[PDB]
């Protein structure tokens, strides 16, 4: 608990800069045609945005109400992640943002979603570290792999077939490395001997590592199925919105319960 | 116990819902709903999205029930679980099934009897919940729950009458909604007093945030209906505001009581 606030502030500045450049480099005629070919996309982003707004509301009430200083700090990090997600989705619904066209279908690659993911996923992993009192170097290395992972995802969408294949597969492979080590550090902390004691009970550490595996796995699955031609773009965008929301509010639902218990 | 009673209320809610959903399926015109969803392409997304939101809202209420700081906390978090669940499946239904609907006199826009059905099962139940929070007289709670139910039916009926009977039934509805909000505001007030016995299960500040939440959120429905019937917003813009309002009205109550549990 040494100003999560500072982490949240750095998050916001990186976001605004990226949002800045996405506005300045946008092609508005291009975005008009994307939203005209795909008429459900504004609704999806709009709806997701409102959802995270209310999600951020709930996290604020968890912060202002320190049942513990341990559980003040953890509710603070979720407030920023959910807020970042809120405004990124508002942006996607309302503004003309620069985007890539993918090699496989010529579908749009939303750099704002990838930007959100790169600011928030490594922060969610750092949050996993506080919950489990993990080694700071072990947390750092997964936060890094996660960031490289996501960039891999984005890059892979604009390469030809074989370099596309390799970068996606390497990405996917790092995602396994990440989920395994995340699973590990929650496990180290579930042990009866473990010092220092974790700020959450044994059961809640387990529900958290299960939540991350179930929710986060949907993104690689959507990307695989859409790139191959098995779902269309809009069906994938829907699953992504539900997944994004699920991944984040899932963590705030499980810690609301910890407060109620203690 | 009172937990058994909340369960029983929830069960009656589910049976009334299924019957109404039943008849809406049996009497649907599928060619009609295909044309409605073809003229208005955002409607499935709105209902779908709202549905997922209430599902997660119902998730949060379950964790509040299993984890009740006190038994009154269990009773109050239990009632919100059923209301949010009812809302969840009503919206899933609207997105996925062909449901019988009315065409309104003013625009020939669809009147979703499933939304009205949800409202009639849940709004009177939310008012009864306001009673437990404020330890109000049972007859005062009953009379607002009744007026609220008649109110909503008034809303629905008014959409399929000609101009002057339409006008009177809507205005009488609107008028009862004022009567309801005033008396709701009252019973929370009686309970905020320092002398009040028996002590309310929520602190003074939270009783105030609740009566403010209901007034802000619930007032959006009559406003959407007024503005759409007159031609100032189109149908889809109104449906969006309704979805956001419905969700807001309900999860607003669960956000404020999550805080009461945290406070000790
Ligand atoms: C360079 C210093 C200038 C000082 C001001 C700060 C802003 C700088 C940042 C981005 C400028 C974007 C310029 C790139 C070219 C225009 C992008 C654009 O208009 O998109 C049009 C579309 O692609 C076809 O019509
Ligand atoms: C928190 C509950 C879940 C979230 C809310 C569920 C209801 C969705 C309604 C509005 C979303 C925000 C407004 C977005 C409305 C659609 C945007 C729009 O209408 O765009 C024009 C269209 O793309 C041209 O064909
Ligand atoms: C639409 C409005 C509805 C409300 C939802 C907001 C929308 C999200 C906005 C920004 C993201 C960053 C928000 C970060 C919140 C951090 C909360 C916190 O920890 O604040 C501490 C204290 O109250 C003060 O110093
Ligand atoms: C690679 C990792 C993926 C994460 C993505 C988040 C960051 C995007 C921010 C800025 C790029 C904008 C600059 C684009 C310049 C456009 C070229 C152009 O049109 O000029 C001729
Ligand atoms: C905890 C459980 C974790 C398990 C994982 C959950 C499910 C992952 C779903 C899909 C991964 C697909 C990866 C397969 C390798 C990629 C094939 C491919 O990339 O297709 C070529 C295309 O050109 C683009 O480059
Ligand atoms: C398919 C790619 C699988 C990647 C394997 C990750 C394994 C991480 C576990 C232990 C490492 C011990 C140091
Ligand atoms: C095929 C690839 C799919 C990827 C699947 C990723 C999900 C990880 C699941 C299990 C890892 C099991 C081995 C990790 C061992 C550490 C955890 C442990 O021992 O559990 C804690 C114990 O209960 C406290 O006392
Ligand atoms: C309204 C028709 C009542 C006649 C049938 C007797 C059933 C009595 C039990 C529960 C109803 C109260 C529901 C309150 C909502 C919580
Ligand atoms: C919790 C917020 C939910 C956000 C998810 C929005 C998209 C989901 C829509 C499904 C029906 C779409 C059918 C056309
Ligand atoms: C998570 C997805 C939800 C999807 C939507 C489906 C409809 C849900 C309706 C009710 C939910 C459960 C209500 C919680 C039960 C509390 C009452 C209780 O269990 O106590 C009574 C006691 O057991 C006496 O026998
Ligand atoms: C306890 C309050 C319960 C009272 C409810 C009374 C219902 C009114 C009957 C309507 C007839 C039609 C019903 C089926 C058709 O223009
Ligand atoms: C047709 C099938 C039966 C479904 C009953 C409709 C229930 C409530 C809608 C409002 C009631 C007032 C209707 C005028
Ligand atoms: C469009 C035209 C419609 C007209 C406008 C809306 C009408 C307001 C409705 C109810 C107010 C309820 C009043 C407060 C509750 C009853 C007061 C009461 O009976 O108590 C005795 C008191 O001392 C004596 O004022
Ligand atoms: C579309 C427009 C919708 C119209 C919505 C109107 C809502 C009325 C709410 C409050 C009025 C307050 C005055 C009437 C009753 C006062 C009770 C009270 O405030 O009591 C608190 C205090 O503790 C005493 O000691
Ligand atoms: C808050 C948002 C979260 C947790 C988002 C998670 C995203 C992923 C784990 C994405 C994984 C991907 C791969 C492993 C390879 C293909 C591309 C990605 C980025 C979808
Ligand atoms: C859980 C959902 C809620 C709180 C729904 C509430 C609905 C209303 C308060 C509707 C009010 C109306 C009027 C006062 C006049 C016109 C008809 C209505 C039904 C739109």
Numbering used by the authors:
A (entry chain A): 49 to 310
B (entry chain B): 47 to 310
Sentences from the paper on this structure:
Enzyme rhodopsins comprise the N-terminal rhodopsin domain and C-terminal enzyme domain, connected by a linker, and function as light-activated enzymes. Rh-PDE derived from Salpingoeca rosetta (SrRh-PDE) was first identified and exhibits light-dependent hydrolytic activity for both of cAMP and cGMP, whereas it lacks pump or channel activity. SrRh-PDE consists of the long N-terminal region, transmembrane domain (TMD), including the rhodopsin domain, C-terminal PDE domain, and 76-residue linker region connecting the TMD and PDE domain. Here, we present crystal structures of SrRh-PDE–TMD with and without the linker region, at 3.5 and 2.6 Å resolutions, respectively.
Thus, we expressed, purified and crystallized the TMD of Rh-PDE (Rh-PDE–TMD, residues 33–316). The structure was determined at 2.6 Å resolution by molecular replacement, using the structure of bacteriorhodopsin (BR, PDB ID: 1M0M22). In the Rh-PDE–TMD structure, the two protomers in the asymmetric unit form a dimer. The interfacial interactions occur in the intracellular halves of TM1 and TM7 of each molecule, whereas two monoolein molecules fill the dimer interface at the extracellular half. TM0 exists on the exterior of the rhodopsin domain, and is located between TM2 and TM3. Trp63 in TM0 hydrogen bonds with Ser136 in TM2, and the other residues form extensive hydrophobic interactions with TM2 and TM3. Moreover, there is no water molecule around the counterion in the current structure.
